[PDB]
Amino acid sequence: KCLLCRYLKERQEKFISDWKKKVIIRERDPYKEEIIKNGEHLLSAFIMYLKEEISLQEIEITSKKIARERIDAKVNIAEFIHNTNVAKIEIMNILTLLNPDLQQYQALVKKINQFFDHLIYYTVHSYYEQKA
């Protein structure tokens, strides 16, 4: 019941390589390598979430990690928002190209939104909680 999931699972490496070229990563960033690892991990979590194999609470560990890294990198936390949205936009593009029917499209858009909304909300919340 999820071609999008199958597509992303098979194309994980390609998806991340393409995403890396579109994100904002500063050469000075001490965690620039972790940015990629976090992305790889969260793409995997996204697939599992669409398959209803994890709950959203399970990404909160990663969100706290990202937040702490961003604090230490001394970068505007909105860059993380931008970089996350690059991935979301591409996933939406892939969903469109797979050409699901309306019912399926609607179900997947809800899950996509729930995942990314939580990731962004929790990471920014955590950034401010930890920086305090």
Closer by beta carbon to a copy of itself, 17 or else 106: 106
Minimal distance in Å, beta carbon 11 to a copy of itself? 22
CB of 10 to Cl ion, least distance (A): 21
One residue of 2, 59, 77, 87 binding a copy of itself per CB under 8 A:
77
For 106, half-sphere exposure in the C-beta direction (CA atoms, 13 angstrom radius) is 3
DSSP class per residue in 16-82: HHHHHHHS---TT-TTHHHHHHHHHHHHHHHHHHHTT-S-GGGGHHHHHHHHHHHHHHT--THHHHH
Q: Report yes or no: 4 and 50 within 8 Å, Cβ to Cβ.
A: yes
C-beta of residue 8 within 8 angstroms of C-beta of residue 47:
yes
Among 26, 32, 37, 82, interactor with a copy of itself by CB under 8 A: 82
61 interacts with a copy of itself by CB under 8 A: no
Question: 105 and 129 in contact (C-beta within 8 Å)?
Answer: no
According to CB under 8 A, which one of 102, 108, 115, 119 is a site residue for a copy of itself? 102
- Which tokens sit at 115? 């995942």
User: Taking CB under 8 A as the rule, does residue 130 contact a copy of itself?
Assistant: no
Provide, rounded to whole angstroms, the least separation between the CB of residue 55 and Cl ion.
11
| Residues near a copy of itself (CB under 8 A) | 76-78, 81-82, 85, 88-89, 92, 96, 101-102, 105-106, 109-110, 113, 117, 120-122, 124-125, 128-129
